[PDB]
DNA sequence: ACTTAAGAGTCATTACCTCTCCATAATGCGAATAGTGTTGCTCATTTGCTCAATGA
């Protein structure tokens, strides 16, 4: 399943905002240590595009994705990639498609080893950042209230 | 009315092998058009799987 339209945009803006709290590279270092490792990959003087939010509200959402996005890498790097950095989700899928290993294709290749193409790309990244969307919300409400 | 000069045109064997060589220069500034990226969406293709008769 999914979420509902006015929780997709809620949860949407929440993260954006978010974005642009983390874009300007004010988390403290020690707190995590993927989005240390992701931030480190861009210059610190970026340019503000985004309206910011304040610093407890962020930090209280920082917390709390990674809090329940600390198993994974792949799906988080994702979230950072188009919430934080600000790229689109196009871009995502395809480098994504340029990057990764042959895989097993079903109903399509009929079983053959082959590279994925773009159309699946763009549909997995879309089935990854709505799973993310869904791990994030119920435990933001649980944050929240 | 016919007879020598001037000028143009068109060829001058076949087959093969090796090597080198085949370019340089006005600036700038908006307007406008073609190109590429983005997101949402539909459509054709294939495959494992399911359902219905039927004789042994």
Wanted: with cysteine; charged share 25%.
């Amino acid at each position: 399943l999914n979420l509902t339209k006015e929780q997709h945009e809620w949860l949407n803006g929440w993260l954006e905002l978010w974005g642009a709290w983390v874009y300007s590279g004010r988390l403290e270092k020690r707190m995590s240590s993927v989005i240390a490792k992701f931030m480190e990959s861009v210059e610190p003087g970026r340019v503000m595009t985004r309206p910011m939010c304040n610093d407890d509200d962020g930090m209280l959402i920082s917390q709390v994705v990674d809090s329940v996005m600390y198993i994974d890498k792949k799906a988080f790097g994702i979230l950072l990639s188009y919430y934080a950095h600000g790229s689109s989700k196009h871009a995502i899928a395809s480098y994504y498609h340029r990057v990764a290993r042959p895989r097993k294709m079903l109903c399509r290749g009929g079983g053959r080893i082959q590279k994925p193409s773009l159309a699946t790309c763009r549909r997995e990244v879309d089935e990854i950042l709505n799973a993310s969307l869904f791990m994030i919300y119920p435990v933001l409400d649980s944050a929240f209230k």
